[PDB]
């Protein structure tokens, strides 16, 4: 699918209802949490960003971003990654993560995330599976660079 990945500078300029509905249906709170908490965690400051994938008809097909990982130094957390069920398996998640990773590694020396359901996806991107309470996957910049330089 042809999508464009855009930085969210104005949350109120997108129709989020489809993403909210589908994610809720599947039992996921991550889109709801992102949007409900957007005054406190706005993804607008230095060291953070939120992206959306837009279809050729400017419908939101996915979201995902990054911000500082609390309590860890030089570490960013990839957050709120979700692709609409009907838009999966067409390379959107990959394009979104590749954009996130490349930008976030300008600020952070390590990226971490928590995903119970998408281990194969994250390992395919180079993340290492870890046994943690707060994180499932991690990637060091040096590893990212080795796969880039
Ligand atoms: C995980 C997720 C972000 C991946 O994004 P995507 O746009 O579907 O992924 P891509 O098309 O870029 O494919 C990259 C990898 O993601 C995985 N993937 C593909 N389709 C998937 C899907 N329907 N569900 C979960 N992972 C999927 C595959 O490992 C794929 O690797 P491959 O192309 O070599 O087969 C997205 O599918 C999602 O938000 N999934 C929700 C969780 C989920 O699907 N749970 C399991 C089913 S209920």
UniProtKB/TrEMBL annotation:
In this record, what's one Pfam family? Answer: Acetyltransf_7
The record, for InterPro entries, names: Acyl_CoA_acyltransferase, GNAT_dom
Keywords from the UniProt entry: Transferase
Q: Which domain of life does the UniProt lineage start with? A: Bacteria
SUPFAM superfamilies with a match to the protein in the record: Acyl-CoA N-acyltransferases (Nat) (SSF55729)
Record-annotated N-acetyltransferase domain positions: 3-149
A molecular function (GO) held by this record is: acyltransferase activity, transferring groups other than amino-acyl groups
Q: Where does CoA bind?
A: 83, 89, 91, 93-94
The name under which this protein is listed is: GCN5-related N-acetyltransferase
What is the organism field in this record? Exiguobacterium sibiricum (strain DSM 17290 / CCUG 55495 / CIP 109462 / JCM 13490 / 255-15)
